[PDB]
């Protein structure tokens, strides 16, 4: 079906518990985009 999220709906979920562990995919790649 059609799942439409407003900007508000999306930002509202920015600080959930799962939104705050870190990402899953972390391959052995050394790049400067990762935050520190």
């Amino acid at each position: 079906p059609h799942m439409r999220y407003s900007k508000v709906d999306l930002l509202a979920l920015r600080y959930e518990g799962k939104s705050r562990q870190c990402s899953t995919r972390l391959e052995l790649q050394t790049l400067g985009f990762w935050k520190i």
Binding site: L10, L13, Q29, F33
Partner: protein, 174 residues
């Protein structure tokens, strides 16, 4: 978790010495929570090295026009000044939220978005599947203009991918 309509893949381009292998597939996600989990742990565009790109495309679509999903398409281009006056980070995020939130009526026409960090200027582009489809591009372009608050003096320019690989010609302007 809150599911997204589509599965999205984040790519990151970084200059290295490689030709087309400079593009790195970071990860994919299909929920709002996992999007933020990724976004919260990567540097914003303003902190990215010169020459590097962020690209968010639907699953199985490569951030290159050669892809079968982009081959007949084009992109809405936003050009931005290097100055701090520009709200580069929040503008890129709003583009991402537009994508994953499916703010466009022609959702199937959206392929992804790309932000380029270059020397003279920065470019944010929204890629669509079919350049010939005027009704699709315009509906998308108008959603962008109304969502991004670009202003009177700033314009959205739609460029066919074929015209890029040749001061690029635009066929629509908003």
């Amino acid at each position: 978790k809150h599911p997204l309509m589509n599965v999205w893949t984040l790519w990151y381009l970084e200059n290295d010495r490689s030709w087309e292998d400079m593009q790195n597939e970071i990860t994919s996600f299909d929920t709002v929570e996992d999007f933020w989990s990724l976004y919260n742990h990567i540097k914003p565009p303003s902190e990215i090295k010169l020459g590097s790109d962020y690209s968010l495309f639907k699953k199985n679509i490569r951030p290159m026009w050669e892809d079968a999903a982009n081959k007949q398409g084009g992109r809405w281009v936003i050009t931005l000044n290097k100055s701090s006056k520009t709200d580069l980070d929040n503008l890129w995020l709003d583009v991402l939220l537009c994508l994953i939130g499916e703010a466009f009526d022609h959702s199937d026409q959206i392929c992804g978005a790309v932000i380029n960090i270059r020397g003279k200027s920065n470019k944010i582009s929204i890629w669509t599947a079919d350049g010939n489809n005027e009704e699709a591009a315009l509906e998308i372009g108008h959603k962008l203009r109304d969502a991004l608050r670009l202003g009177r003096n700033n314009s959205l320019q739609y460029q066919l991918h074929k015209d890029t690989m040749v001061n690029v010609k635009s066929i629509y302007t908003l």
